[PDB]
Design a protein around this ligand. Structure first.
Ligand SMILES: Nc1nc2c(ncn2[C@@H]2O[C@H](COP(=O)(O)OP(=O)(O)NP(=O)(O)O)[C@@H](O)[C@H]2O)c(=O)[nH]1
Ligand SMILES: [Mg+2]
Lengths: 880, 190
């Protein structure tokens, strides 16, 4: 009669809570937060679990009895308890405990509080934690059903416990019980307890390891139901201290290589995945006998499901090549400021693994057969070669696609580890795959592509017509027509085929080119972006070779077409400009009949972005925030023109204000911009120093300030830029040595510094020294070691050449500064294949210098203990 | 033609309120005017299997409604656990929602979304996202900003609900009434 006309008010607030909408929202939020003041009713208007359910609604009551209730934990978590400490109010609900069954749903809608109201009152670990045992083995069938009331809480222990020697020696005699509740016929009662009787750490890592019985009491504990045998097959292959597995181990692998097979897909994933977790070596002593015991099942998983096949086939049916690409399918793309680097012969992994943007979504089994098979070339190699052929021999024609595909996949799936040994059959497979590409197996051509390329390296390191000519012929037919899925797999592949053949494609240019040029007329947005990338790659590979009227004349028109079509805000500019940026460098001077506007666009973009920034900084309300990426891309393209046109760009620069735009960019508050400008100052310095020189007194100190390894990439380009500047101005460099030399010698000896930064630093120090021997020479013993160690691995070229001219020069001014480490230099010298006679004669002197230091016999003997190649090169430089 | 209980959990600010706004609006909307009373926006997609009523429960991440935690998760049919790739935390302050969700709804389908991938400064690299692979959900890089994959969560949810992998939304406009479409074109003169 008192709070009775009020409780029938919650039966009303739940008729708005449950069925909530905009009004009820911002409106009911008042009534719900005004009933937290007259707290003489909530402490009562809560028991409403078997009161409100057992009153009117069901779904609605549970939304307060299980609903609003939980919102009080917030009133105890956020309070420290001085509010409501009351133990009746505490035991009033700690009494609802023995009410585990009023509609199994509501049979837990309160049991999570038993975790909350224990984390905000952890002490007192026994008045409530008494139900622990006071219901523990109670689930042994003792309520509505047997467990359908007692079990509807046994699980509420897994949650309250795991989700929440003080008391380390008390709980042991309780958690050992859980092993019991296992052979029960009930699902929950089996698993609910089980997977939970496996969440182990250190809090009481006792009964655990000692159990070799819960190994076989489970090594046979198959599907007590279904949704459990999975969380079971989740724990065995879930451990680190495999001291006890070592024993029962040649069975776990047997009662597993099949539990990953159990038809219920969800299980196999929890198995296969958690299974092939081949950590350290010992995990392959077993895989030895397991060569045939798994390379049939996994292989037979390497095929798509009937549905992952459905979800695919969608945009598979070659007839979408004319369907526009949705804007919601254009993954955001950015521009990374160019980093000036060196080359190391035919020697990626530290760049391509930074882009696992897809696989992270579709985690079926297929992305785990091969995904776990990612060990049979990481742990061992060519071990699988034998026996797999017949699998992949029939597979390559057996049945329809699903299987053929699983074959063409596995093939490429292994080449990066089982290569050499595979190379043997390689001369027969390859010309075949080249057939697959020509099928009608749309989703098969895809992997035919990715696979061919997967190991085309070989096809290139072979005779032409044999197959590097036909491959590049059918691969190209795929670049076109087909479905868009094919098109991508196509290009991306060929894209790699290029980077490989580098300069060997030159013969079949006109051809390759017309394939690409036609694509621009058939490709959709999504693929067009890869088309751009393709071309830029082709250009980087072929080199100046691309500079010929016939080629240029058919490649530009399509690019110009795009160029005039994009707003200065369209992100496609990145791919397009990045492409150009390349092409422009390959056409060297041959791009002239195009540079003025390319140049102009860049300068203007930098000019617009710099402004857009300031305006946005001051009036965020009015002007939007510019994306500095357009500066970086433009800066990088100007840096590309200057390299290709080099010198011919003199005029353009003179009538523009890049030099002014430099002060602005080298001073920008964003690293990448700063990084790109330096790459430019460097190239400009090579092309038209005449125009830079006047600002050297300004710029120099700026660069000095940027030799801060706090942003290596910026440091890297500033370093290289100082190197090219010192060469353009000889001894007139003398005065700027102090504000640079120290930081350089510091970096060259800086731990954990990236190769490229050490190579440039080495090179620049070389140059400064080549210009001011007296100035840098006295400090030779402070860098000569990292200097050699570093430069010995760089390709001969202009840069390596100047650097050695400088060291050689300094060595003469201060021989004593290198004698001690004379073996380091020798190796560095012997890394040269063919050097200019000029420099070759400086080597000769320094060497004879060393001979004079150790004596004819020591030098004879030393000189001889070199592996053949070096041995001869050294001989050739020395002139007895 | 069916209503659905879709809870939009996820840390505060992550995008939830703009993300939904996107399917309702026609453009972005920057500001951050934190959500207080967990708002209920209704969404409807047109599929090859008919229409779909999705009642999006725009939850809150701030202590604006940080009071009413669960309660909506009650009798929920599907969930979207959203964070922020540009936020070190969020992806960390996440497994706390998967739980305070699986508690109530005990097996609804849930989609985990790394939002704001339209930013160069990606704090939570994809390679750092293994949750879904384990607690077995579905992942999607997305951007309420640009619309990248801004439909995938729903399509995957619908497909899981209705139980039809062949289901898809028909963005494609209408043409001639399917039952009057004339002979292929070649069947014309065949
Ligand atoms: N660049 C970019 N900004 C985004 C993106 N998504 C959201 N934002 C911005 O991030 C801010 C917060 O978004 P909002 O939708 O309010 O987040 P919320 O998670 O719904 N807030 P609350 O937890 O309080 O309910 C807004 O300025 C919004 O425009 C995105 O994908 N890209
Ligand atoms: Mg909001």
């Amino acid at each position: 009669y008192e709070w009775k006309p009020d409780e029938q008010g919650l039966q009303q607030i739940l008729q708005l809570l449950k069925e909530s909408q905009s009004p009820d929202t911002t409106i009911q939020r008042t009534v719900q937060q005004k009933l937290e003041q007259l707290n003489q009713y909530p402490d009562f208007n809560n028991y409403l679990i078997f009161v409100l359910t057992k009153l009117k609604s069901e779904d609605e009551p549970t939304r307060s009895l299980s609903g609003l209730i939980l919102k009080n934990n917030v009133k105890a978590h956020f309070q420290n308890f001085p509010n409501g400490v009351t133990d009746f109010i505490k035991s009033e609900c700690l009494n609802n405990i023995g009410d585990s069954s009023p509609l199994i749903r509501a049979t837990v809608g309160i049991l999570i509080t038993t975790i909350a109201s224990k984390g905000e009152l952890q002490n007192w670990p026994d008045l409530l934690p008494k139900l622990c045992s006071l219901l523990d083995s109670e689930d042994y069938n003792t309520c509505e059903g047997a467990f359908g009331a007692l079990q509807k809480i046994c699980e509420d222990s897994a949650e309250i416990l795991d989700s929440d020697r003080p008391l380390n020696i008390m709980i042991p005699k309780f958690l050992q019980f859980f092993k019991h509740s296992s052979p029960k016929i009930r699902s929950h009662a089996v698993a609910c307890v089980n997977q939970f009787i496996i969440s182990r750490t250190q809090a009481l890592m006792l009964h655990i390891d000692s159990f070799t019985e819960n190994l076989f009491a489970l090594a046979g504990d198959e599907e007590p139901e279904v949704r459990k045998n999975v969380c079971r097959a989740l724990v065995m292959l879930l451990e680190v201290r495999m001291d006890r597995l070592l024993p029962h181990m040649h069975n776990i692998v047997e009662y597993m290589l099949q539990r990953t097979q159990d038809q219920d897909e969800n299980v196999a994933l929890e198995a296969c995945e958690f299974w092939l977790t081949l950590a350290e070596q010992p995990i392959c002593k077993d895989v030895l006998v397991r060569h045939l015991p798994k390379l049939i099942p996994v292989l037979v998983n390497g095929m798509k499901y009937s549905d992952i096949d459905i979800i695919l086939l969608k945009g598979d049916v070659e007839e979408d090549e004319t369907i526009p690409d949705s804007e919601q399918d254009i993954r955001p793309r950015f521009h990374r400021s160019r980093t000036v680097a060196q080359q190391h012969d035919e020697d990626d992994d530290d760049d391509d693994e930074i882009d696992d943007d897809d696989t992270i979504s579709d985690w079926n089994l297929r992305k785990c057969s091969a995904a776990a098979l990612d060990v049979l070339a990481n742990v061992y190699r060519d071990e699988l070669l034998p026996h797999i052929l017949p699998l992949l021999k029939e597979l390559l024609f057996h049945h329809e696609w699903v299987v053929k595909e699983s074959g063409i996949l596995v093939l490429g799936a292994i080449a990066e580890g089982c290569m050499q040994g595979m190379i043997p059959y390689l001369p027969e497979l390859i010309p075949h795959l080249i057939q697959c590409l020509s099928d009608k197996k749309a989703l098969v051509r895809s992997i035919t592509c990715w696979t061919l390329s997967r190991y085309a390296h070989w096809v290139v390191s072979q005779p032409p017509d044999t197959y590097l000519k036909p491959l590049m012929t059918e691969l190209l037919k795929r670049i076109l027509d087909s479905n868009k899925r094919v098109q991508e797999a196509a290009c991306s592949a060929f894209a790699t085929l290029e980077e490989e053949a580098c300069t060997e494609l030159v013969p079949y240019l006109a051809y390759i080119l017309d394939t690409l040029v036609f694509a621009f007329s058939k490709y959709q947005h999504k693929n067009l972006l890869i088309l751009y990338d393709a071309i830029g790659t082709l250009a980087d590979s072929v080199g100046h070779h691309l500079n010929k009227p016939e080629y240029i004349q058919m490649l530009m028109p399509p690019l110009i077409q795009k160029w005039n079509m994009l707003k200065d805000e369209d992100k496609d500019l990145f791919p397009l400009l990045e492409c150009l940026s390349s092409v422009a460098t390959a056409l060297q001077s041959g791009f002239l009949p195009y540079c003025e506007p390319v140049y102009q666009r860049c300068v203007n973009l930098v000019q617009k972005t710099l402004a857009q920034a300031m305006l946005n900084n001051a009036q965020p309300d009015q002007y939007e925030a510019p994306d500095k990426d357009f500066m970086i891309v433009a800066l990088d393209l100007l840096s590309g023109l200057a390299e290709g046109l080099g010198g011919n760009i003199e005029q353009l620069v003179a009538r523009s204000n890049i030099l002014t735009l430099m002060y602005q960019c080298m001073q920008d508050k964003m690293p990448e911009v700063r990084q790109s400008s330096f790459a430019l100052l460097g190239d400009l310095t090579k092309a038209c120093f005449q125009h830079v020189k006047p600002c050297i007194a300004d710029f120099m100190p700026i660069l000095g300030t940027n030799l801060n390894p706090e942003f290596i990439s910026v440091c890297n380009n500033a370093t290289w830029a100082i190197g090219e500047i010192s060469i353009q101005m000889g001894i007139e460099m003398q005065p700027y040595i102090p504000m640079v030399l120290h930081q350089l010698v510091e970096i060259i000896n800086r731990p954990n510094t990236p190769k490229t930064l050490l190579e440039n630093t080495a090179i620049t120090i070389g140059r400064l020294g080549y210009v001011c021997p007296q100035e840098v020479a006295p400090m030779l013993q402070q860098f000569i070691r990292p200097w050699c160690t570093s430069l010995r691995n760089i390709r001969d070229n202009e840069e390596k050449d100047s650097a050695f001219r400088g060291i050689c020069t300094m060595i003469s001014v201060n021989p004593s500064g290198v004698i001690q480490d004379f073996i380091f230099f020798c190796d560095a010298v012997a890394s040269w294949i063919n050097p200019k006679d000029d420099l070759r004669d400086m080597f000769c002197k320094i060497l004879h210098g060393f001979k004079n230091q150790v004596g004819d016999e020591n030098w004879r003997r030393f000189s001889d203990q070199f592996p053949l190649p070096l041995k001869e090169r050294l001989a050739a430089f020395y002139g007895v | 033609q069916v209503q659905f209980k879709l809870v939009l959990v996820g840390d505060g600010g992550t995008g939830k309120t703009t993300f939904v706004k996107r399917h309702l609006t026609g453009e972005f909307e920057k500001k951050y005017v934190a959500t207080l009373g967990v708002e209920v926006h209704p969404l409807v997609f047109h599929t090859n299997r008919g229409p779909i009523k999705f009642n999006v429960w725009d939850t809150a991440g701030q202590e604006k409604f940080g009071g009413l935690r669960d309660g909506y998760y009650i009798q929920a049919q599907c969930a979207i656990i959203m964070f922020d790739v540009t936020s070190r935390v969020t992806y960390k302050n996440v497994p706390n929602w998967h739980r305070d969700l699986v508690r109530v709804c005990e097996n609804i389908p849930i989609v985990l979304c790394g939002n704001k991938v339209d930013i160069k400064d990606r704090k939570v690299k994809a390679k750092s996202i293994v949750f879904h692979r384990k607690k077995n959900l579905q992942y999607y890089d997305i951007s309420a900003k640009s619309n990248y994959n801004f439909e995938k969560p729903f399509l995957w949810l619908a497909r899981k609900l209705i139980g039809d992998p062949n289901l898809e939304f028909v963005a494609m406009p209408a043409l001639a009434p399917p039952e009057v479409v004339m002979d292929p074109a070649l069947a014309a003169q065949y």
